[PDB]
Design an enzyme around this catalytic site. Structure first.
Site, PDB file in Angstrom:
ATOM      1  N   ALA A   1      23.908 -32.649  11.023  1.00  0.00           N
ATOM      2  CA  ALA A   1      25.650 -32.776  10.680  1.00  0.00           C
ATOM      3  C   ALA A   1      25.591 -31.857   9.051  1.00  0.00           C
ATOM      4  O   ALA A   1      25.736 -31.727   8.195  1.00  0.00           O
ATOM      5  CB  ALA A   1      26.192 -33.686  10.657  1.00  0.00           C
TER       6      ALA A   1
ATOM      7  N   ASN B   1      14.572 -23.336  13.804  1.00  0.00           N
ATOM      8  CA  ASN B   1      14.017 -22.617  13.620  1.00  0.00           C
ATOM      9  C   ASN B   1      12.375 -22.569  13.136  1.00  0.00           C
ATOM     10  O   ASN B   1      13.105 -24.414  11.966  1.00  0.00           O
ATOM     11  CB  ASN B   1      13.786 -21.246  12.874  1.00  0.00           C
TER      12      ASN B   1
ATOM     13  N   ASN C   1      20.874 -15.563  15.318  1.00  0.00           N
ATOM     14  CA  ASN C   1      20.105 -16.053  13.880  1.00  0.00           C
ATOM     15  C   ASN C   1      20.819 -14.874  12.738  1.00  0.00           C
ATOM     16  O   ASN C   1      21.590 -13.654  13.336  1.00  0.00           O
ATOM     17  CB  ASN C   1      18.639 -15.015  14.479  1.00  0.00           C
TER      18      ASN C   1
ATOM     19  N   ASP D   1      23.019 -18.252   2.701  1.00  0.00           N
ATOM     20  CA  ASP D   1      22.503 -17.645   3.795  1.00  0.00           C
ATOM     21  C   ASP D   1      23.012 -18.853   5.240  1.00  0.00           C
ATOM     22  O   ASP D   1      22.929 -18.099   6.468  1.00  0.00           O
ATOM     23  CB  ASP D   1      22.106 -16.855   3.841  1.00  0.00           C
ATOM     24  N   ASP D   2      22.469 -19.826   5.071  1.00  0.00           N
ATOM     25  CA  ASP D   2      21.965 -21.035   5.710  1.00  0.00           C
ATOM     26  C   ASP D   2      22.887 -21.242   6.107  1.00  0.00           C
ATOM     27  O   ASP D   2      23.208 -21.668   7.232  1.00  0.00           O
ATOM     28  CB  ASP D   2      21.152 -21.790   5.225  1.00  0.00           C
TER      29      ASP D   2
ATOM     30  N   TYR E   1      10.087 -11.959  10.852  1.00  0.00           N
ATOM     31  CA  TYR E   1      10.756 -12.983  11.284  1.00  0.00           C
ATOM     32  C   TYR E   1      10.215 -13.971  11.822  1.00  0.00           C
ATOM     33  O   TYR E   1       9.111 -14.787  11.772  1.00  0.00           O
ATOM     34  CB  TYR E   1      12.076 -12.250  11.536  1.00  0.00           C
TER      35      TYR E   1
ATOM     36  N   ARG F   1       1.026  -1.265  -0.248  1.00  0.00           N
ATOM     37  CA  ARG F   1      -0.481  -0.571   0.130  1.00  0.00           C
ATOM     38  C   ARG F   1       0.765   0.998  -0.042  1.00  0.00           C
ATOM     39  O   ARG F   1       0.924   2.221  -0.974  1.00  0.00           O
ATOM     40  CB  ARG F   1      -0.902  -0.455   0.896  1.00  0.00           C
TER      41      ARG F   1
ATOM     42  N   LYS G   1      13.167 -11.901   3.945  1.00  0.00           N
ATOM     43  CA  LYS G   1      14.842 -12.281   4.139  1.00  0.00           C
ATOM     44  C   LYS G   1      14.831  -9.924   3.880  1.00  0.00           C
ATOM     45  O   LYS G   1      16.075  -9.729   4.305  1.00  0.00           O
ATOM     46  CB  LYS G   1      15.695 -12.916   3.100  1.00  0.00           C
TER      47      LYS G   1
ATOM     48  N   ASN H   1      19.862 -29.786   1.775  1.00  0.00           N
ATOM     49  CA  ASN H   1      21.154 -30.062   1.551  1.00  0.00           C
ATOM     50  C   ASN H   1      22.252 -30.704   1.158  1.00  0.00           C
ATOM     51  O   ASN H   1      23.815 -29.430   0.681  1.00  0.00           O
ATOM     52  CB  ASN H   1      21.423 -31.077   2.911  1.00  0.00           C
TER      53      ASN H   1
ATOM     54  N   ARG I   1      13.329 -26.780   1.982  1.00  0.00           N
ATOM     55  CA  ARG I   1      14.230 -26.492   3.357  1.00  0.00           C
ATOM     56  C   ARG I   1      13.838 -25.198   4.120  1.00  0.00           C
ATOM     57  O   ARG I   1      14.706 -24.433   4.696  1.00  0.00           O
ATOM     58  CB  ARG I   1      15.197 -26.861   3.507  1.00  0.00           C
TER      59      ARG I   1
ATOM     60  N   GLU J   1      18.890 -19.466  -0.280  1.00  0.00           N
ATOM     61  CA  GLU J   1      18.011 -19.452   1.290  1.00  0.00           C
ATOM     62  C   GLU J   1      17.863 -20.808   0.723  1.00  0.00           C
ATOM     63  O   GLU J   1      16.486 -21.023   0.095  1.00  0.00           O
ATOM     64  CB  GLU J   1      17.149 -18.613   1.193  1.00  0.00           C
ATOM     65  N   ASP J   2      17.255 -21.646   2.022  1.00  0.00           N
ATOM     66  CA  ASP J   2      15.998 -22.690   1.980  1.00  0.00           C
ATOM     67  C   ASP J   2      16.128 -23.585   1.377  1.00  0.00           C
ATOM     68  O   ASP J   2      14.830 -24.245   0.235  1.00  0.00           O
ATOM     69  CB  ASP J   2      14.861 -22.589   2.498  1.00  0.00           C
TER      70      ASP J   2
HETATM   71  N1  LIG Z   1      19.454 -19.994  13.665  1.00  0.00           N
HETATM   72  C1  LIG Z   1      19.734 -19.529  12.365  1.00  0.00           C
HETATM   73  O1  LIG Z   1      20.496 -18.318  12.407  1.00  0.00           O
HETATM   74  C2  LIG Z   1      19.882 -20.644  11.366  1.00  0.00           C
HETATM   75  C3  LIG Z   1      20.242 -20.609  10.073  1.00  0.00           C
HETATM   76  C4  LIG Z   1      19.731 -21.619   8.865  1.00  0.00           C
HETATM   77  C5  LIG Z   1      19.522 -22.713   9.457  1.00  0.00           C
HETATM   78  N2  LIG Z   1      18.643 -22.967  10.568  1.00  0.00           N
HETATM   79  C6  LIG Z   1      18.096 -23.811  11.343  1.00  0.00           C
HETATM   80  O2  LIG Z   1      19.008 -25.122  11.722  1.00  0.00           O
HETATM   81  C7  LIG Z   1      17.941 -26.471  10.968  1.00  0.00           C
HETATM   82  C8  LIG Z   1      18.438 -27.091  10.178  1.00  0.00           C
HETATM   83  O3  LIG Z   1      19.221 -26.475   8.954  1.00  0.00           O
HETATM   84  P1  LIG Z   1      20.174 -26.962   7.540  1.00  0.00           P
HETATM   85  O4  LIG Z   1      19.807 -26.602   6.986  1.00  0.00           O
HETATM   86  O5  LIG Z   1      21.244 -27.762   8.902  1.00  0.00           O
HETATM   87  O6  LIG Z   1      19.393 -28.808   7.498  1.00  0.00           O
HETATM   88  P2  LIG Z   1      19.878 -29.902   7.101  1.00  0.00           P
HETATM   89  O7  LIG Z   1      18.590 -30.480   6.858  1.00  0.00           O
HETATM   90  O8  LIG Z   1      20.667 -29.414   6.262  1.00  0.00           O
HETATM   91  O9  LIG Z   1      20.310 -30.845   7.668  1.00  0.00           O
HETATM   92  C9  LIG Z   1      19.970 -31.254   9.177  1.00  0.00           C
HETATM   93  C10 LIG Z   1      20.678 -32.441  10.085  1.00  0.00           C
HETATM   94  O10 LIG Z   1      20.269 -32.683  11.074  1.00  0.00           O
HETATM   95  C11 LIG Z   1      20.361 -34.191  11.702  1.00  0.00           C
HETATM   96  N3  LIG Z   1      19.017 -34.111  12.678  1.00  0.00           N
HETATM   97  C12 LIG Z   1      17.568 -34.365  11.632  1.00  0.00           C
HETATM   98  N4  LIG Z   1      16.385 -34.925  12.818  1.00  0.00           N
HETATM   99  C13 LIG Z   1      17.434 -35.323  13.766  1.00  0.00           C
HETATM  100  C14 LIG Z   1      17.321 -35.908  14.793  1.00  0.00           C
HETATM  101  N5  LIG Z   1      16.149 -36.282  14.921  1.00  0.00           N
HETATM  102  N6  LIG Z   1      18.037 -35.527  15.713  1.00  0.00           N
HETATM  103  C15 LIG Z   1      19.889 -35.237  15.240  1.00  0.00           C
HETATM  104  N7  LIG Z   1      19.776 -35.256  14.270  1.00  0.00           N
HETATM  105  C16 LIG Z   1      18.705 -35.122  13.380  1.00  0.00           C
HETATM  106  C17 LIG Z   1      20.009 -34.237   9.719  1.00  0.00           C
HETATM  107  O11 LIG Z   1      20.077 -35.397   9.918  1.00  0.00           O
HETATM  108  C18 LIG Z   1      21.046 -33.390   9.033  1.00  0.00           C
HETATM  109  O12 LIG Z   1      21.927 -34.009   9.669  1.00  0.00           O
HETATM  110  C19 LIG Z   1      16.645 -26.001  10.878  1.00  0.00           C
HETATM  111  O13 LIG Z   1      15.400 -25.818  11.314  1.00  0.00           O
HETATM  112  C20 LIG Z   1      17.156 -24.384  10.018  1.00  0.00           C
HETATM  113  O14 LIG Z   1      15.269 -23.338  10.866  1.00  0.00           O
HETATM  114  C21 LIG Z   1      19.180 -22.001  11.540  1.00  0.00           C
HETATM  115  O1  LIG Z   2      16.520 -21.192   9.150  1.00  0.00           O
HETATM  116  C1  LIG Z   2      16.865 -20.468   8.569  1.00  0.00           C
HETATM  117  O2  LIG Z   2      15.660 -21.406   7.325  1.00  0.00           O
HETATM  118  C2  LIG Z   2      17.481 -19.261   8.065  1.00  0.00           C
HETATM  119  O3  LIG Z   2      18.002 -18.619   7.307  1.00  0.00           O
HETATM  120  C3  LIG Z   2      17.408 -18.703  10.101  1.00  0.00           C
HETATM  121  O4  LIG Z   2      16.645 -19.237  10.561  1.00  0.00           O
HETATM  122  O5  LIG Z   2      18.031 -17.912   9.887  1.00  0.00           O
HETATM  123 MG   LIG Z   3      17.672 -20.539   6.138  1.00  0.00          MG
END
Ligand SMILES: NC(=O)c1ccc[n+]([C@@H]2O[C@H](COP(=O)([O-])OP(=O)(O)OC[C@H]3O[C@@H](n4cnc5c(N)ncnc54)[C@H](O)[C@@H]3O)[C@@H](O)[C@H]2O)c1
Ligand SMILES: O=C(O)C(=O)C(=O)O
Ligand SMILES: [Mg+2]
Ligand SMILES: NC(=O)c1ccc[n+]([C@@H]2O[C@H](COP(=O)([O-])OP(=O)(O)OC[C@H]3O[C@@H](n4cnc5c(N)ncnc54)[C@H](O)[C@@H]3O)[C@@H](O)[C@H]2O)c1
Ligand SMILES: NC(=O)c1ccc[n+]([C@@H]2O[C@H](COP(=O)([O-])OP(=O)(O)OC[C@H]3O[C@@H](n4cnc5c(N)ncnc54)[C@H](O)[C@@H]3O)[C@@H](O)[C@H]2O)c1
Ligand SMILES: NC(=O)c1ccc[n+]([C@@H]2O[C@H](COP(=O)([O-])OP(=O)(O)OC[C@H]3O[C@@H](n4cnc5c(N)ncnc54)[C@H](O)[C@@H]3O)[C@@H](O)[C@H]2O)c1
Ligand SMILES: NC(=O)c1ccc[n+]([C@@H]2O[C@H](COP(=O)([O-])OP(=O)(O)OC[C@H]3O[C@@H](n4cnc5c(N)ncnc54)[C@H](O)[C@@H]3O)[C@@H](O)[C@H]2O)c1
Ligand SMILES: NC(=O)c1ccc[n+]([C@@H]2O[C@H](COP(=O)([O-])OP(=O)(O)OC[C@H]3O[C@@H](n4cnc5c(N)ncnc54)[C@H](O)[C@@H]3O)[C@@H](O)[C@H]2O)c1
Ligand SMILES: O=C(O)C(=O)C(=O)O
Ligand SMILES: O=C(O)C(=O)C(=O)O
Ligand SMILES: [Mg+2]
Ligand SMILES: [Mg+2]
Lengths: 553, 553, 553
Positions: free
Chosen positions: C292, C401, C446, C258-259, C92, C71, C163, C239, C145, C235-236
């Protein structure tokens, strides 16, 4: 293409005329707005030549074709392309001047940006009024030295317009990436000041610090909207302002001066071609200029750069160069003032001080003579006859424009010397046939052979600043394209008919140099500079304006 | 439509949301600007009810639904069409009044034209600022009498916005041919004057002749740009200006007053249906209004026009009509002032002078009772109780809006008279079941049953003026649609759920009248008046935006 | 601004509401289209907070405020600026996740660009449909993701939209220079596939080479229209594609993920602040990750970078790093596959191989615990209580998150450790007041504290590619702004309320870095990097749209 309907026809950048396919007509909202006939650009061209052929005067032909640029851009360049050689005299020198000294008379639609001193403090808002938003090349003038015609003021806008035209029709730069500009701070020409058709401010030229602030404000505004490396070719300013602004911006912007550096490159190239026939020992080189201004000083500095690159010191090279102006020979201590740039070519007065140019020719006995006074036929027969006597194969260059200010003609040069000369002109002259059958086909020493290609390279390479070596290089690239067969006709320059490729070849060489000297910022660097250049040239061939329609699986 | 790309989506009149076809998206430059999914209006309609269902407040619902009209016009109207009856109390009375008195707080985007006294002399320039160029109907207010809510200044622009919604949602008038307007000449509302959110001029109301000239300048401006027969529906003005302006313009422009004339038609209609159950002898018809303003005198007039058509002399008719205002019973020779319009119903004081409205009921012993005072619950139980004793089947019409100012509720009317009353309200009320099980379903005496259909007729016929008999005919057209079944439930009006067809049906009767009385100028005259009307209604269904492509033989 | 009238109010970029000045209204053709009142942005903001204060649910508030951006852009960011800390959980995390999961239900108007696999071969035409023509920053997702929410397909567009708001509300990047994009190649989420409201292609995710070719064609198309140094924040994604595309592009384009990188920079900075309270012998550092993936492996490599730069070899640094995923501890020789990237942290198994995460904690006895699985409360009380024992001051980081997927809460962390822990959450949590009265104020790890400033710098310096040290620096630039007194509350990060300066400050640091390392190509180089940056930030205060009108001498 975000527009549809009539607007598409009103804008010459998009107007296709009857070449609009039915698909486009129906799909863009033009059906019923054009005759039920679908034409080819081929027919459209045929229409032009048929009509142009019937016209009589060159100013009438010039008005016609230039108007096409206002109706259909694509056909406009298509028509030039059809034969740039026969249309250059109409669209370029010598008839372009005639049009400028008539600008207010033949006015129909304006072209380019117009910034006047009364707009100072708001130059940015004016720039923001320009339609195209991705300009890459600017050609600016203030109209104080339009060719050898003098102060023409705003009637001078026909020069940048005409120059940018050649950018595209010669080097394929994009029409919508060009922007001719004119800075109007007034004019001193009493005549236009009394003319009611005049298009500029009715006042004398303001030379106060207010003038300089404006060009400052202009340069800033331009680069803000379009970018720091926007090309800015300075054209036809007054001698003081020319160097003044050149030296003051050449290091802060991507700017150059066509009259100073552009001309230097061309001349050095013709002289280079000539040596291929003379092969006259460096030591014995003596050059004498008629006029010591923007162009003379420029060529002189490039001639030196080349002589240096062939042994000779900077000092000994300049001592081989003499200049004669409206006050006489430039010797040390004379009454007529000598400026910074002239100093290196100002020498200790000879035994006899030449009163007339014939005197200087007879006393100094030069191997080359270059006319750059823009004062008319100063290369009198007594002179050409003298040069014919002093040198077996004299070098006579008359480059003032247009043909009326030319120091002499091709006819005069070849007949007065018995075809033993090496001639070149700024304006066009046809082949000359001697009483005894020998035919001599002179070339044209015009910066038209240089600025379109240099500009291209500089643009494609994202160069930020231009150095004189580039022009030296450029000059080399041009003469390097001359064939011994063309040379064996009296030509020190490659056929005009091939200025399109010549320009491209020029541009290819310059980008090689720019990149090789770490002056290019385009990233990444092309492996094959040639393919690179040809890949990006603008074409006159119509483009489909049809929407991207497809079926999904 | 002449444009493409994003603008198509920014404009609600054309925005289709995900309902844009692939061929449309690709052929109008929208591919990429919308998700890869194509929807149907049906789905979008589903997205609406699902969401509206979760909301809790009516003003919250108002803001949401009114917001659609600013996002996707066609969908907006489809959503009303889906269930006008349930949405009506949200967009129209009573929620609309709440919204108006809060216009400043909930502001998001403006709607309609705003002409202030500060723009007098330049009202035409304002009229030319309007985007749509074929307006056919206008609804204007100055905000002095917004319902029974009073002076709300520019906050009252909510009414013309809502009224014109009904044009389209009820009679199929085109949205782009409607224009809501507001004349801001100040406000006497002390609270709004101190409200930082008020949307109008912070000054008291200008009653000087400057006020009158402004309206004239407005009526002249409008008709110059759109036409002399453009419909102008005056709405919610002050008592004085209401009559004054109607009388002054009714025979010069195609204008009419809703609060006076439209309210007249509905009430007569409900009074007619009633008679069908009572069949009270013309001789014994005694009426008593609670309020003697815009609405009261408009009804009184129309009532008399019918009584006459049914025998009675004008004089005798009026004698059967009394009025009671904030000062008391209108009797000849009273302290309070009576005016040009009241005189006819201002009669010789009765044996006793009623001090309250109960007394008046007891003294006069009227058959009918009409609340149109806009002052709240003045039809007290004692009054209702008294009406029931005096009459076997009394008639109780409380028409003041909004609900809070109504004279009494349906439950009160039905319960307090043992279900023997014949009731109609101005604002919505649901069915009432007495302790004895009998269920009564009341009707809504609101001019929304009238204005949309009469406006459609005048427009289509190219009528230049509206006479009082046009409403007389509209009232006859409305009631003539009531079936004894719905009648039997206690409704003196066709169900609200069918307002769309009732309206058209009304529009067809009237367009027949106009033609038959030489008041229609549309030419030629249609053979089948019904087929002609239904043929030109605006549909809420999306139309195809595709260009007319096709191959030539 | 090239347009006038309605269009000015219909486009949110220009729409000012009642803040349009009278001169602007009269000069741009809006007189009459807006109510007679002139409002200040300060009054408009007042209306927003008053309206917002009434609302009850967060998603309701989300819809309100995100709607303002469609708007009145200028007011949208002013409303943010007014209190980014309180509106962040709404715009956010976590409320943006809730919205993404319901994108199809709350849909009103679209945002960003949409490229589907069905559009391969024409991604350029889709890119050419975008209004703004000077984009500088893109943020792209495929929706596989979305946070720890999973495959949400096109309903995932709510992430890049959000974002990109931060880019402007945090670092002052220009709104119109930003472009969110969504690649729709299908979704595997069974539920969305049977959801009629879904906004993407109804098909499972296509993973053939056709997928890659699209990203290839997307990448190329973007850079061609807007330039090669255009910022492309990924973003998102899933893997495999995350890393795959990172390493495949990071050196051909100006791109980052970014992740992986973003989160690395934030986790290191919180970990660095912590060390300032623990001053633990580098030798005795043991880090264990929960999960991991993309993020886990990202922080690791940066942790190691920091360690290395403070002594320790690459080898010895990674030896201090252990990771435990869904299959268990990553030890050499295990069944569950290990990938190129995990290897350096895949160690020779310990005496007893942990079955539960609590085991891995009790076996390895880590100093730090980093939650990054996105699987819910896996940091059970027993783990928290185990850490509490093993370490005097354990470091517990739950960064998944949204909040529902968070490994644990602040209340749990502090309460279960007697307040001896150093905690940080991915999502917001308020202060915690122990039974003993002590109050702990947690920080928010974050990447929002990182991408906004890092992007600003990369853009302003005309950087071509992004190395990892950029993040190391940005990580160093963030913690360096933490004040002991703040640290003394339990916050390893600067207050949220000052995310604006922090971002600007980080930006300044990073640009100094880029220039100092020959990665910046903006020319010329600023002298004062700070003034240079503050100079170019986008403001939320309205701009005058008045034409430049001035008198000539
Ligand atoms: N806070 C921030 O700034 C920020 C930034 C990016 C991502 N994240 C969060 O991190 C989380 C994962 O992101 P990612 O891109 O690394 O994901 P990803 O899928 O690439 O990796 C997830 C990993 O966790 C493992 N996993 C899944 N369930 C599990 C469980 N129940 N017990 C033990 N291990 C388990 C998986 O095997 C995998 O290796 C998401 O929830 C995302 O929201 C936060
Ligand atoms: O969790 C996510 O997907 C992010 O990019 C973040 O929170 O930093
Ligand atoms: Mg993300
Ligand atoms: N052929 C080309 O490519 C080309 C390019 C640029 C300029 N030119 C031409 O060169 C001419 C001069 O250009 P410029 O920019 O150097 O001008 P300028 O005014 O800066 O310099 C002209 C010089 O010639 C001298 N001069 C004038 N009249 C003379 C006379 N009657 N006798 C002897 N000397 C005289 C002047 O004193 C001055 O020093 C113009 O006519 C112009 O059209 C040709
Ligand atoms: N795109 C356009 O601008 C456009 C398109 C179609 C028709 N028209 C106008 O319609 C006129 C031709 O008459 P017609 O075919 O509409 O029927 P008509 O002649 O039977 O209609 C008589 C009048 O009623 C008006 N009208 C018709 N339907 C209306 C509706 N649903 N809501 C509000 N007003 C309505 C018309 O404007 C017309 O002035 C022409 O004068 C033309 O200007 C304009
Ligand atoms: N139901 C419908 O279709 C419809 C249509 C138009 C108007 N209305 C409603 O009718 C009401 C009146 O509108 P109007 O334009 O005729 O108003 P008005 O101001 O022109 O006239 C009001 C009359 O009511 C009288 N009155 C006010 N308070 C009174 C009181 N306390 N006791 C006795 N008499 C009192 C006044 O003296 C005055 O004569 C409004 O509330 C309006 O919303 C209903
Ligand atoms: N109306 C227009 O289209 C318009 C107006 C002003 C400037 N410009 C552009 O600015 C460039 C000249 O550089 P400058 O004077 O803007 O500053 P600058 O040279 O200091 O900035 C360097 C780069 O950062 C970008 N930039 C600057 N501030 C930004 C911001 N706040 N958010 C996102 N990107 C930002 C610029 O686009 C530029 O490419 C020109 O290339 C021109 O195209 C365009
Ligand atoms: N519709 C548009 O606005 C549009 C379309 C295509 C490309 N572009 C521009 O092109 C740049 C991408 O580079 P590229 O693929 O064009 O080539 P490139 O990067 O190889 O060329 C380098 C520079 O030379 C310029 N250039 C290329 N050909 C030119 C020509 N024939 N005449 C004049 N200038 C020319 C370009 O604008 C560019 O800044 C982008 O920065 C983008 O802004 C714009
Ligand atoms: O003479 C001029 O004005 C020129 O720039 C030229 O012809 O080269
Ligand atoms: O009461 C009003 O203001 C009306 O016009 C109505 O509701 O009929
Ligand atoms: Mg020149
Ligand atoms: Mg009313």
């Amino acid at each position: 293409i975000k527009e549809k309907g009539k607007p598409l026809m009103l804008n010459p950048r998009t107007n296709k005329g009857m070449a609009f396919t039915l698909q486009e007509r129906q799909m863009l909202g033009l059906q019923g707005l054009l005759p039920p006939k679908i034409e080819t650009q081929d027919i459209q061209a045929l229409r032009f030549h048929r009509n142009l052929k019937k016209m009589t005067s060159p100013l009438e032909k010039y008005i016609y074709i230039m108007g096409i640029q206002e109706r259909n851009e694509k056909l406009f360049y298509r028509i030039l392309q059809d034969d740039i050689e026969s249309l250059m005299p109409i669209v370029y020198t010598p008839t372009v001047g005639l049009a400028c000294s008539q600008y207010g008379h033949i006015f129909r639609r304006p072209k380019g940006l117009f910034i006047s001193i009364s707009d100072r403090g708001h130059v940015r808002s004016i720039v923001d009024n320009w339609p195209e938003n991705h300009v890459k090349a600017v050609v600016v003038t203030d109209g104080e030295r339009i060719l050898g015609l003098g102060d023409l003021g705003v009637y001078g806008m026909g020069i940048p317009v005409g120059k940018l035209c050649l950018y595209t029709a010669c080097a394929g730069i994009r029409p919508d990436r060009c922007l001719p500009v004119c800075i109007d701070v007034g004019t001193d020409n009493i005549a236009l000041l009394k003319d009611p058709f005049y298009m500029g401010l009715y006042q004398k030229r303001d030379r106060t610090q207010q003038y300089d602030d404006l060009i400052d404000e202009f340069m800033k505004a331009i680069t803000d909207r379009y970018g720091r490396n926007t090309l800015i070719q300075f054209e036809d300013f007054g001698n003081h302002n020319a160097f003044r602004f050149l030296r003051k911006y050449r290091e802060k912007y991507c700017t150059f001066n066509d009259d100073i550096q552009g001309t230097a490159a061309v001349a050095l190239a013709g002289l280079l071609a000539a040596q291929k026939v003379i092969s006259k020992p460096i030591s014995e080189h003596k050059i004498l200029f008629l006029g010591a201004g923007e162009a003379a000083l420029g060529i002189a500095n490039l001639i030196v750069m080349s002589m240096v690159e062939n042994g000779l010191s900077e000092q000994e090279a300049q001592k081989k160069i003499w200049m004669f102006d409206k006050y006489g020979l430039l010797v040390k201590g004379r009454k007529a003032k000598i400026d910074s740039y002239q100093e290196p070519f100002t020498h200790s007065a000879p035994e006899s001080i030449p009163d007339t140019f014939e005197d200087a020719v007879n006393i100094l006995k030069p191997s080359t003579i270059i006319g750059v006074a823009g004062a008319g036929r100063l290369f009198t027969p007594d002179v050409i006859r003298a040069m014919a006597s002093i040198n077996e194969r004299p070098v006579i260059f008359a480059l003032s424009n247009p043909t009326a200010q030319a120091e002499c003609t091709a006819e005069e040069a070849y007949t007065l010397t018995e075809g033993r000369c090496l001639f070149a002109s700024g304006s066009p002259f046809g082949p000359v046939k001697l009483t005894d059958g020998r035919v001599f086909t002179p070339g044209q020493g015009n910066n038209v052979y240089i600025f379109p290609g240099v500009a291209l390279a500089v643009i494609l390479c994202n160069t930020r600043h231009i150095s004189d070596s580039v022009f030296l290089e450029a000059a080399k690239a041009l003469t390097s394209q001359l064939t011994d067969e063309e040379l064996a006709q009296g030509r020190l320059y490659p056929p005009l008919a091939n200025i399109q490729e010549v320009s491209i070849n020029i541009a290819i060489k310059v980008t090689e140099y720019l990149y090789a000297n770490k002056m290019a910022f385009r990233y990444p660097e092309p492996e094959d500079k040639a393919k690179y250049v040809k890949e990006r040239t603008w074409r006159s061939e119509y483009d489909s304006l049809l929407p991207d329609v497809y079926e999904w699986p």
